[PDB]
DNA sequence: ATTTTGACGCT
DNA sequence: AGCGTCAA
């Protein structure tokens, strides 16, 4: 009753950009605006990996991981547009430099956490706060919430998307008082108003469109904004969640949708979030963990307690490759020439970042993978990063894998190498 | 023969 | 530290 938590001090928003690489490549490009378009890495095999997709693509089946050559059957007029490559590799500058540009915007508005290239948490608790102290007891009009959904409604006693927006977000303005100040529920929707407002300076400013959640947790504000995409937000209010809760997969959570959600699922019997409100918090932590056990017996009562990381740049900076089938590196100079074309795209990215956030790395990570072991990493080793130098990054990643080799033969590397990936770790002021 | 990333937990 | 999990 009255000591029991609802987690609901906080107001989080989850931003994520639509179609991120289709976007920045149809900026650069207007003819794939308004097309199905899809990203590819490579064009040799199959036609190229694709990475990211349109939406008038995906109406036709087009997904991820499909090879250019498939997508192609699902959709012949799919045009294309190719990741840069660059010593003899897939190179991501554009889209990490297009991530700096709404990043960039996103931290006007409050502290951001960078979750990935293309989305960011807010924690917007103390902009509510003084947005409705501006505010001065004003109700809030639709007018500001032009393309926010309120999930769960409408409800109870149009046949078009717009207007079952629109019946909802009235029902819930309706029913707000907008006097409270203290009001979770109109809490989140001045943080709706605002996430609006930034939504709208991240359009205006780079030309992309994103989607949003809007919520009380990082967890629920990144499952609200799911909901609605593209280019709408949702809000998922406390009230919400048990409706909510009640159909949606425990792999939907995030965390949930791999091995331990599967876990939870077998070894609990249930197929939904909501169903988890059946076990206590000591049943859930003898199956899952103190931790995990903990987390999910709040997360299904709509309570997270993670902050919002005040992040705004990677913590690492990292160069992979795959070498898969025939490509496999079998000599010492192609394992050498690989290492140092790894190194050169780290030297320029180090040295770019050093320049830019005044840190420097510390420690290198080489990781590779062996023909034949069944792990993606075979062996992951650190040695000391002093010096922002591509031949003497490549000569300690050769030096701290070379005993990897077992052939007895000088020339020649064995097992053949399928993976190789340099990363600076350890940031310290400079 | 999706690939190229990136954060964080475990022991 | 090196390895594993989970997510863009
Ligand atoms: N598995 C992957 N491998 C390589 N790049 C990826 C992968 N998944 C995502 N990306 C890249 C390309 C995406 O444009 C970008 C953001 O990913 P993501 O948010 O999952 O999808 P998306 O932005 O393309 O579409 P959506 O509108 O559904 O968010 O990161
Ligand atoms: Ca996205
Ligand atoms: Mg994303």
Request: charged fraction near 25%; charge should be positive.
């Amino acid at each position: 009753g009255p000591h029991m938590a609802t987690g609901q001090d906080r107001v989080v928003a989850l931003v994520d950009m639509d179609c991120f690489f289709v976007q920045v490549e149809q900026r650069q490009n207007p003819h794939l605006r308004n097309k199905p378009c899809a990203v590819v890495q490579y064009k040799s095999w199959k036609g190229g990996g694709i990475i990211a997709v349109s939406y008038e693509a995906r109406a036709f089946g087009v997904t991820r991981s499909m090879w250019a050559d498939d997508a192609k059957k699902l959709c012949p007029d799919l045009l294309l547009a190719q990741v840069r490559e660059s010593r003899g590799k897939a190179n991501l500058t554009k889209y990490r430099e297009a991530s700096v540009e709404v990043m960039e915007i996103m931290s006007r508005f409050a502290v951001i956490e960078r979750a990935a290239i293309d989305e960011a948490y807010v924690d917007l608790t103390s902009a509510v706060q003084e947005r409705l102290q501006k505010l001065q007891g004003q109700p809030i009009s639709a007018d500001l919430l032009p393309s926010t959904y309120i999930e769960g409604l409408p409800q109870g006693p149009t046949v078009q998307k717009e207007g079952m927006r629109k019946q909802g977000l009235f029902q819930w303005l309706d029913s707000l008082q907008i006097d409270n100040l203290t009001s979770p529920d109109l809490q989140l929707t001045v943080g709706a108003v605002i996430v609006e407002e930034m939504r709208a300076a991240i359009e205006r400013e780079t030309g992309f469109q994103c989607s949003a959640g809007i919520s009380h947790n990082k967890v629920l504000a990144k499952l609200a904004c799911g909901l609605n995409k593209p280019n709408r937000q949702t809000l998922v209010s406390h009230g919400s969640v048990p409706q909510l809760f009640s159909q949606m997969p425990i792999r939907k959570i995030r965390s949930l949708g791999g091995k331990l959600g599967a876990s939870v699922i077998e070894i609990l019997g249930i197929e939904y979030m909501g169903e988890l409100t059946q076990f206590t918090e000591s049943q859930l932590q003898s199956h899952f963990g103190e931790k995990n056990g903990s987390w999910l017996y709040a997360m299904c009562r709509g309570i997270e307690h993670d902050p919002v990381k005040p992040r705004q740049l990677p913590k690492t900076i990292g160069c992979s490759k795959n070498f898969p089938g025939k490509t496999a590196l079998a000599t010492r100079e192609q394992v050498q020439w690989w290492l140092l074309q790894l190194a050169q795209e780290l030297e320029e990215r180090l040295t770019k970042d050093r320049n830019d956030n005044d840190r420097v790395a510390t420690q290198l990570v080489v990781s590779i993978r062996v023909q034949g072991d069944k792990r993606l990493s075979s062996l992951r080793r650190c040695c000391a990063l002093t010096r922002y130098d591509a031949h003497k990054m490549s000569h300690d990643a050769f030096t701290v894998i070379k005993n990897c080799n077992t052939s007895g033969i000088q020339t020649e590397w064995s097992p053949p190498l399928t993976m190789l990936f340099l990363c600076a770790t350890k940031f310290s002021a400079s």
